[PDB]
Amino acid sequence: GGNIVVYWGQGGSDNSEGSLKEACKSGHYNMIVLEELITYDNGRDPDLNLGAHCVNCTSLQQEIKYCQLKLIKILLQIGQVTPTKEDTKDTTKDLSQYLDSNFFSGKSGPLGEVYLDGIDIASVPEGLNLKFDELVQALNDSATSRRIYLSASPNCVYPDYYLDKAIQTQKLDFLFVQFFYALPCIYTQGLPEDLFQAMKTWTSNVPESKIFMALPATPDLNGYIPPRVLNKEILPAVTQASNFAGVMIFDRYFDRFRKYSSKIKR
Amino acid sequence: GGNIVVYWGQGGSDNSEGSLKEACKSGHYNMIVLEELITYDNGRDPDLNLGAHCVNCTSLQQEIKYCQLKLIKILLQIGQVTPTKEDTKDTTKDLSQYLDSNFFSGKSGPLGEVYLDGIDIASVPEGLNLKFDELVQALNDSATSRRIYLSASPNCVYPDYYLDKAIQTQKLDFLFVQFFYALPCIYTQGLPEDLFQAMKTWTSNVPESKIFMALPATPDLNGYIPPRVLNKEILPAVTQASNFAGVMIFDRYFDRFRKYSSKIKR
Ligand SMILES: *[C@@H]1O[C@H](CO)[C@@H](O[C@@H]2O[C@H](CO)[C@@H](O)[C@H](O)[C@H]2NC(C)=O)[C@H](O)[C@H]1NC(C)=O
Ligand SMILES: *[C@@H]1O[C@H](CO)[C@@H](O[C@@H]2O[C@H](CO)[C@@H](O)[C@H](O)[C@H]2NC(C)=O)[C@H](O)[C@H]1NC(C)=O
Ligand code: NA
Ligand code: NA
């Protein structure tokens, strides 16, 4: 089956996109990125935002552990940095410490008593105080024997305006490169040329990281690649890169109904 | 000040984007579109999704009423239709009835004991059973003496693939035409030509509806129009349309920090 990851958490409620446990139980995925943690440039404690799944999300603990028991990695995405004009000391250091204590120590944090597998950073602006590359360095230099995977979700345009500094730390394990919405590098009908060139650029310029092609599971999003095109046309070309890792599915909501991941080649 | 509306509800928590009451109290807006209600193609009761603002959102009642007391209209956006392959009878009729009872009757629904001012529909796919134009007709033919405003948020491409049928009912009071993200009709630096042509097309083809130009409040989104450009370059041209209504701000989160609406001409 190879490596197929998925985003979950912003697809509505358990009714609309399924529980986290349902996603894991499906067997389609070996990694899930939870969307998303809101962080504060002024150092206020982060706010978890799993939409209509939960407000008290501590009961997700058992679902996270169920997933991990099935060898599925669970990463939390930082999706929003609320900016401040105030100059505040130690914001990045303090966020790293907050994350370590609340998600990477088995202690009672917003997702219950878990050890998550890592942190993803969305392609969004950093703060005047909170800096992504500094955060990546801090997390990797965490006082723990646990492995904290670090990743980012840049758009397919290289360099990514928001994430390039974090990428150039050389400390990201995975990149989920987004080939959806309107960008010059997405697949369009009968035209993978720009996608191929972008994949060449990402794989060659970030040889230290595993590169995922993040694709939409619905034809109602720009960048959609029909499964036969993906299997016969795209994967044969992009898999020539030694650091091509697999496909990241945007997102669990669309995949739950479309069963796109089910149609990807073995 | 004219007509300035804003989207609120998907900007995170009260910490990140402010409470609904804060938005109303700011005095920047005369209409707020709440994002967003999830509806079900199989007829399951809708799920409210105000992200990390609340799970039990009934206490928003007092904030909605405070807003309405300041002559601010509050509309709820349908942002997601969860599809089914099942053929289910009366889905659209039953949704209209659910909305009437739960948001337009002063009874105890998901937002407490309110009479909302209307319903907006996002540019998203309808269902195999739930149909937007039929929903608009049903809501307008509601057994009530209350005014239910109906609107949609099409992208700037005309016709809008998802919403054109609803628009052609001629029963939409407002259109919030979205000139952001990557589309051929957005403003780009020194180039309003495509935006002007799109505004001409929308205003001339939908003369029965009030047309809002929905714009991003942050330079970090495609389509951003610097305030001086908006005031001196865009508004003088587009305001020549008799049905040009004003500016819709995407969104309260960005506006709270950028104060974009504050910089729009009187
Ligand atoms: C920071 O990055 C380094 C390099 O990837 C990680 O070091 C690896 O750790 C694993 C398990 O601890 C070892 O099996 C490897 O031998 C290490 N590799 C190297 C090159 O030293 C380290 O674990 C990361 N820090 C965190 C908190 O995950
Ligand atoms: C359906 O649309 C019609 C037309 O816009 C609305 O009828 C108006 O209602 C207001 C207040 O009830 C009256 O002042 C107007 O005279 C009516 N206009 C016309 C042309 O009849 C009607 O209210 C809408 N239905 C709902 C539930 O809002
Ligand atoms: Na879709
Ligand atoms: Na921004």
Author numbering:
A (entry chain A), B (entry chain A): 7 to 272
How did the manuscript describe this experimental structure?
.To gain further insight into structure-function relationship of such chitinase like lectins in general, GlcNAc binding glycoprotein, a tamarind chitinase like lectin (TCLL) was identified and analyzed by X-ray diffraction and biochemical & biophysical approach. TCLL displays significant sequence and structural similarity with members of GH18 family but the active site residues for chitinase activity along with chitin binding cleft residues were found to be mutated. So, TCLL lacks chitinase activity as well as binding to chitin polymer. Moreover, the structure depicts evolutionary relationship with class III chitinases and bestows the ability of plant to expand the sugar binding domain.
Here, we present a high resolution crystal structure of TCLL and its complex with GlcNAc.
